[PDB]
């Protein structure tokens, strides 16, 4: 039962804030966190949540939910704040997971939160992982071997040396998931170890574990809406919430890498003039724009970041404007520093990382994550026995 994400329409700005700033869903076994999302109605609706353990391939594991929880699932989100003193009225929902109802999440592994809306209907659903600490995933990006795909590829090599979990059948038990930045769609998963030189596995080859480099994320920071801040020129208020027009981006694949730093997708909801940035930020129709004259195919350029789960709904599809030969689309987005990127999609879900409209430069600063699933053949679920983060500011060729 490959239960997958479900993108909403009203709800926007769905994230997993932990320790303040947003994060990727990968969580520790007892680390607290939230699921801040925002409804675009003054309707103080009732959003009942759920949680489900899941397998490697996201088939819902057959554990009883009294086993991977202690508490309840379907109970409406108590805490929520309304958009205070803003043009786009919205209801900021929020729920900490070590809360009153589900007083903790007591099993590592995959999960899937559901935000079914007041009857049973799943509005949305995000995936996260609660990794336990028993291995020592020693990873490091490093340039590939094949000279052709070396200027725009980032091989990833590492080991798993645990002195806590003696692996039974490491070729068949220890499955691994590799994440490029925080994305779940481009994970390079289902990889068997090469060596197993002892109690420790070792993954070394350059066939499977090889991510496309991908250039750096673009951004824009409309701290104050009516400003003229970072590449948001011609901000115009017209009979609506504000409109933030962005400078026409240019395809960077046909160019050389230029050191251009980002925070790898994450946005920062924020404003000046605001006490609490969560309920006091203001949505604003931002008009994106892509000038890629070399790009000519039958695939669709979708906008993508961390604010929208790297999703590919039709409410992010760039649109060719023959009057200018320039893609363009409006996307309502909360204020603050926001990263994004133009990811082509095949037509349905196939991303086609190569031939991306931005580039694949091997030296871009990506932060790769590695999750080590594991399932003894007496256990009733796939644990997660340690993650190892290793980014590409250390491409040790």
């Amino acid at each position: 039962i490959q239960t997958e994400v479900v993108p909403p329409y009203n709800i926007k700005t769905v994230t997993f804030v932990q320790n303040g700033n947003n994060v990727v869903p990968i969580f520790e076994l007892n680390s607290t966190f939230e699921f801040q999302f925002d409804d675009l109605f003054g309707n103080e609706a009732n959003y009942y949540f759920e949680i489900t353990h899941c397998d490697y391939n996201w088939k819902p594991s057959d554990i009883p939910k009294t086993d991977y929880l202690r508490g309840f699932d379907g109970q409406r989100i108590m805490d929520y704040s309304n958009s205070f003193n803003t043009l786009q009225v919205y209801s900021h929902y929020r729920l900490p997971f070590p809360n009153q109802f589900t007083t903790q999440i007591r099993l590592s592994g995959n999960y899937i939160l559901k935000i079914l809306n007041e009857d049973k209907e799943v509005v949305l659903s995000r995936k996260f992982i609660v990794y336990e600490e028993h291995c020592t995933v020693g990873a490091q990006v490093k340039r590939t071997r094949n000279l052709s795909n070396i200027n725009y590829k980032q091989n990833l090599d590492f080991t798993i040396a645990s002195n806590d979990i003696t692996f039974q059948t490491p070729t068949q038990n220890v499955k691994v998931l590799l994440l490029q930045n925080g994305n779940f769609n481009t994970a390079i998963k289902n990889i068997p170890p090469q060596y197993t030189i002892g109690n420790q596995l070792v993954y070394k080859y350059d066939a499977e574990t090889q991510f496309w480099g991908g250039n750096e994320f673009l951004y824009f920071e409309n701290k104050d809406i009516r400003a003229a801040n970072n590449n948001v020129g011609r901000i115009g208020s017209n009979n609506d919430i504000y409109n933030a027009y962005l400078y026409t981006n240019a395809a960077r694949g046909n160019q050389i890498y230029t050191n251009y730093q980002d925070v790898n997708g994450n946005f920062v909801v924020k404003n000046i003039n605001g006490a609490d940035n969560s309920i006091e930020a203001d949505y604003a129709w931002v008009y994106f724009t892509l000038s890629a004259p070399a790009f000519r195919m039958n695939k669709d350029i979708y906008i993508t970041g961390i604010f929208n789960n790297y999703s590919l709904s039709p409410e992010y599809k760039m649109d060719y404007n023959t009057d200018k030969a320039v893609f363009e689309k409006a996307v309502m987005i909360k204020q603050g520093f926001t990263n994004y990127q133009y990811t082509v999609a095949d037509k349905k879900g196939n991303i086609d990382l190569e031939n991306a409209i931005d580039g694949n430069f091997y030296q871009t600063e990506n932060e790769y994550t590695i999750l080590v699933y594991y399932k003894e053949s007496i256990d009733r679920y796939q644990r997660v026995i340690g993650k190892g983060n290793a980014n590409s500011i250390n491409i040790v060729n």
Binding site: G42, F72, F101, T169, Q172, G198, R226, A228, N273
Partner: protein
């Protein structure tokens, strides 16, 4: 007076003033001063400081000698040190007493002491001149009789561990009691020496057509490499020569294609050769200065071989060896590997362990069991270690093992999932070669049952019971430790040899989570939990576990079932007969509830409740078995644990309690006679004429009696139950701060019935000018007993009537708590037609906490009032007003009971009034307006009531729009 202090000559601060008194120093009698530092003076080449010396005024004039500002440093004060030294010549005082710096901090009295000259004299004396006519008196060996400062080394001290800086003064005058005022100054180190670097990171990766994947490496660094940003103290200090050859064959492809065996045969070799910069003996010397000497080639073998951290692994393995298919079918997965290593270092002198290994796996995975598992592996460790003689007996460290799992899985019915999985860990012991007897199954060292059976409780089958999906769970456990031979054959010094060990555990998890989805008044959910837990520990259990598990205590005992198996176990005779036995039978238990409703009264609001009742006992006891009767004896048991129910005390929650009068607390001061009279009825029969403290038969003593106070005070209560008895006032405390009166309420200590603690949330006021209206309300409370106990005095003895006058209580405790707190009491937010977006919480909360330690409850307050406001409007003038208002308040009254002395102990009265007036003038230039403002009143007389304000405009000009 004698010499005005002046900074040293070449410095852009203060200095020591070691100052000999009037008695003077002897010919060789020196004083000193010391601190403790961890300096590493191996990177630097010269240890250079300043000195100085006057003659002490009104004393004999000092000459330009018989004063030496000796330094010591190393590991110690009289066993290891590196005396620098210098003949101090007095600065010419007796005059203006304001001499320039160049004449005060002289150069003649100044030390440079190139450090590499110290290692010279260390070599000249290490293993030389030991305690024979050269080491002068204190074994210091001032270098003399054979080739400025008169250096000296005593016990071969060290750099880097340069601690114990001693900076004293030593005289060398023949017939004189010297008296001076020596100073000391900047003790820095000179220039540090640099070096070059090296590297080589050869790598090789091959693929012989999916069959061999040899992937080798290797790197050869050198001393002091680091990187660019690395200075001269962070580069490197070791020569490393790594390389790792790591090959996969496949050994299943050269077999015929049909068979399909997968013998992987991984392989791996690698080693390092770390040669340190400084030898790991006499750390302050480099290897080169020893190895670049021909002192003795038989000793140059000792050197440059006791300074190499050699270590190589050389692993083997056949981990995944199966057959592909494409009971009674070899779907196993064999495995086998043994690693190795052989290390040198400074002092291990030899090292090697070859941890062999095996494996086997079944994992079939089919009313009959859906799964089956099994797996064993002999984890044969090993080890050896000599030590550097300066050789010793190698410490043979062998470790062997054996172990296995079972696992079942089941689908006994639809909605029933009996699981199971045992395990074991038994120690091989045949002691030699690790590849000696390799199938022997040593005695059991551990054994862990487990059982898990969920169950859906089919109740949907009954017609009307389609609204419940009440589940259930259960997870028994078990565990049998071996109680290592320090226990098993303990020998009483009488000579006998007792047996005592092999503890046992249990566990449970009784969970059942109904839901009661009401789709058959006005309710939508009643979800429930109940998760018991438990577990014993029965040390002193003699017998063992054969194999495939054990049902020795009782087959219920190995699956929870915590009936006392410790009586018959003593009767059966498999319980330890020692009778001074340390360890103690224990137990545990836990309980919970969350009966959360979702009552929906009106068409758009929704209320909902909660129910929490936790609990836990941790009873334990020492015991002993009788020899003759062979019977059990619980030696002084006891219990302790937590407690909490979700009560409701909103009755007495708005009465005034303001440190001068409080209705509820006066009820509590009153009830302590009603309840004393009540629960003496239970103790003294109703036909006994319950005795008092002032009645005739029970008189009041003379004033000079040791108990005259408890009878003068505490006049008419029953003899057993005073007004400080923890049962006269605990139920009084509950009856007071709940509103529920005494004389009708319980006198108990534990309350097994939670109370909803509603969280009303009204929303349906919408039915035009209000763009959205709302309300809300919460309520939480508890009776959290942080911990209770069981009095060892309330046992059976003819002893009631405690130290002062109270009856002993079965359940001691301390610091009951009532934590009644309102989350937003009447919080209502709403937005008008344009915008008047008012928000207003009234949070509020008490926290009563009576401490039976001293019998004086406490209290807290709240009422953190809040009022938002705002007028966001945009045409093209954009007006924006962001005003609000807060307030807070606290108290920590400490209310005595017997007499009115409730004296406050904390508080706050903060309130802020911040607000803004953002008004974008036309399109580009806005103008905000701060008015932050807040008192902080004085609740106690030590707060210093603040008040601090902000204000001010800002005039943005958004240029490029």
């Amino acid at each position: 007076c004698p010499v005005n202090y002046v900074m040293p000559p070449g410095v852009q601060e203060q200095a020591l003033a070691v100052r000999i008194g009037g008695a003077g120093l002897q010919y060789q009698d020196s004083r000193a001063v010391f601190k403790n530092v961890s300096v590493d003076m191996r990177q630097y080449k010269k240890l250079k400081m300043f000195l100085h010396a006057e003659s002490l005024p009104n004393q004999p004039t000092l000459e330009d000698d018989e004063m030496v500002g000796f330094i010591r440093f190393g590991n110690d004060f009289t066993q290891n040190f590196y005396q620098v030294e210098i003949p101090l010549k007095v600065t010419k005082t007796g005059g203006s007493c304001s001499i320039s710096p160049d004449l005060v901090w002289m150069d003649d009295n100044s030390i440079d002491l190139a450090l590499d000259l110290l290692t010279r004299m260390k070599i000249k004396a290490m293993s030389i001149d030991i305690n024979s006519s050269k080491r002068d008196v204190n074994g210091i060996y001032y270098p003399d009789n054979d080739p400025k400062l008169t250096l000296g080394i005593k016990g071969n001290p060290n750099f880097g561990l340069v601690r114990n800086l001693m900076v004293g003064v030593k005289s060398r005058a023949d017939h004189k009691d010297i008296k001076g005022e020596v100073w000391f100054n900047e003790l820095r180190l000179a220039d540090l020496e640099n070096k070059g670097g090296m590297a080589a990171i050869l790598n090789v990766d091959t693929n012989m057509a999916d069959f061999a994947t040899v992937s080798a490496t290797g790197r050869k660094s050198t001393i002091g490499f680091g990187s660019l940003e690395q200075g001269a103290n962070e580069r490197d200090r070791e020569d490393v020569q790594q390389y790792n050859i790591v090959t996969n064959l496949n050994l299943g492809k050269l077999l015929p294609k049909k068979w399909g065996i997968n013998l992987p045969f991984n392989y791996a070799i690698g080693e390092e050769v770390i040669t340190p910069e400084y030898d790991p003996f006499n750390q302050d010397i480099k290897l080169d200065q020893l190895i670049r000497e021909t002192t003795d080639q038989a000793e140059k073998d000792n050197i440059r071989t006791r300074a190499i951290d050699y270590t190589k692994r050389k692993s083997i393995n056949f981990i995944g060896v199966r057959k592909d298919r494409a009971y009674d079918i070899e779907n196993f997965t064999f495995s086998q590997s043994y690693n190795q290593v052989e290390r040198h270092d400074y002092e291990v002198a030899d090292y090697e362990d070859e941890q062999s290994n095996s494996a086997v796996n079944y994992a079939y995975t089919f009313y009959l069991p859906s799964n089956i598992s099994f797996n064993t592996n002999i984890l044969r460790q090993s080890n050896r270690q000599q030590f550097r003689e300066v050789g010793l007996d190698p410490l043979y460290r062998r470790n062997f093992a054996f172990n296995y799992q079972y696992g079942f899985g089941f689908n006994l019915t639809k909605s029933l999932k009996l699981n199971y999985s045992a395990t074991s860990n038994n120690i091989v012991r045949n002691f030699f070669n690790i590849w000696d007897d390799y199938l022997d199954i040593g005695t059991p060292n551990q054994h862990a049952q487990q059982l898990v059976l969920n169950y859906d409780i089919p109740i949907n089958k009954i017609p009307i019971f389609g609204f419940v999906k009440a589940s259930y769970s259960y997870t028994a456990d078990y565990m049998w430790q071996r109680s290592s031979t320090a226990f098993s054959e303990y020998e009483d010094p009488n000579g006998t040899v007792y047996d005592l060990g092999n503890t046992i555990q249990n566990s449970n998890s009784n969970t059942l989570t109904t839901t009661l989805n009401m789709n058959t008044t006005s309710i939508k959910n009643v979800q429930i939990n109940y998760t018991k837990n438990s577990g014993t520990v029965l040390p002193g259990y003699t017998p063992s576990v054969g194999f495939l598990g054990t049902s020795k205590p009782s087959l219920g005992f190995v699956f929870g079932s915590q009936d006392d198996v410790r009586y018959e176990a003593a009767k059966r005779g498999w319980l330890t007969t020692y009778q001074d036995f340390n360890q103690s039978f224990t137990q545990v238990s836990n309980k919970l509830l969350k009966v959360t409703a979702n009552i929906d009264l009106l068409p758009d609001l929704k209320v909902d409740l909660s129910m929490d009742r936790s609990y836990s006992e941790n009873t334990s006891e020492q015991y002993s078995v009788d020899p003759s009767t062979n019977e059990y004896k619980p030696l002084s048991p006891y219990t302790y644990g937590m407690f909490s129910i979700s009560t409701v005390m909103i009755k007495t929650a708005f009465s005034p309690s303001d440190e001068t009068q409080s209705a509820a607390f006066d009820d509590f001061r009153s009830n302590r006679l009603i309840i004393a009279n009540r629960l003496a009825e239970g103790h003294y029969g109703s036909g006994v004429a319950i005795p008092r403290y002032g009645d005739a038969n029970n008189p009041i003593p003379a004033e000079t009696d040791p108990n005259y106070a408890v009878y003068t005070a505490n006049q008419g209560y029953p003899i057993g139950y005073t007004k400080s008895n923890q049962a006269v006032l605990l139920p009084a405390f509950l009856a007071a701060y709940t509103g529920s009166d005494a004389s009708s309420s319980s006198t108990n200590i534990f309350r097994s019935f939670p109370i909803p603690n509603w969280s009303i949330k009204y929303n349906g006021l919408m039915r035009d000018k209000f763009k959205r209206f709302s309300l809300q309300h919460n309520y939480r409370a508890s009776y959290t007993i942080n911990q209770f106990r069981s009095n060892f005095d309330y046992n059976s003895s003819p002893k009631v009537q405690d130290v002062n006058t109270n009856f002993y209580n079965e359940i001691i405790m301390s610091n009951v708590n009532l934590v009644e707190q309102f989350s937003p009491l009447i919080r209502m937010d709403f937005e008008l037609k344009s915008s008047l977006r008012v928000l207003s919480e009234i949070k509020k909360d008490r926290a009563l906490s009576m401490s039976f330690d001293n019998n004086l409850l406490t209290e807290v307050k709240g009422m953190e009032y809040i009022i938002g406001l705002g007028y966001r409007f945009k045409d093209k003038s954009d007006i924006n007003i962001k005003a609000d208002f807060s307030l807070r308040n606290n108290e920590t009254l400490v209310r005595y009971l017997d007499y009115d002395n409730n004296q406050l102990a904390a508080g706050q009265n903060i309130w802020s009034l911040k607000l803004t007036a953002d008004y974008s003038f036309s399109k580009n230039l806005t103008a905000i307006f701060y008015y932050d403002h807040s008192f902080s009143k004085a609740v106690i007389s030590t707060s210093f009531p603040l008040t601090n304000i902000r204000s001010g405009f800002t005039l943005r000009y958004n240029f490029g729009n």
